[PDB]
Amino acid sequence: CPQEDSDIAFLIDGSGSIIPHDFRRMKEFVSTVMEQLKKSKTLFSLMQYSEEFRIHFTFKEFQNNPNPRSLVKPITQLLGRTHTATGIRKVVRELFNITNGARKNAFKILVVITDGEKFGDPLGYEDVIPEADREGVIRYVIGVGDAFRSEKSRQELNTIASKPPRDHVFQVNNFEALKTIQNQLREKIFCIGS
Secondary structure, eight states, rough: OOOOEEEEEEEEEEEETHHHHHHHHHHHHHHHHHHHOTTTTTEEEEEESSSEEEEEEEHHHHHHSSSSHHTTTTTTOSSOOBBBEEEEEEEEIIIIIIGGGOOSSSEEEEEEEESSBBSSSSSOGGGGGHHHHHHHHHEEEESGGGOOOOOOHHHHHHHHSSSHHHHHEEEESSGGGGGGGGHHHHHHHHHHTO
């Protein structure tokens, strides 16, 4: 696929629903996918969410230190509950903002990794997905673990992801299984315009 400028954000769940061994496996997967996606025209940014929100690095910080593993490895887990909708709003408004190094005219891609249903959030998905669509943010979702095995639970993943959901939703049975989708995720993003 011909390469074009892409600004790729990750939004990772840091709720206490994720045990520390699993959080480390998540950090390894984000590190590896970012390494595999690194091309001259890509920038990355990462936010962790629970009921709190932490920008671990902006697109501008990445551009100045474009070393994903070094940026991801030190992060520590927030703990707490699971405010996925507010996390999506903060990605759209803060990570994809010119002040934070997002580029005019680049593709805007968000990968959400969630371990559990939204809970505690003052926002619904109806409060944040229309604005994400207006702003052109292409969303991928990875639902990890037992929380997304039932067909009803999967609706939430579809609600987060861009349409069609079969091309944008991943469900993996546990954190050890995240590596099994690295090449697929890579190819989807490498080829977004092509």
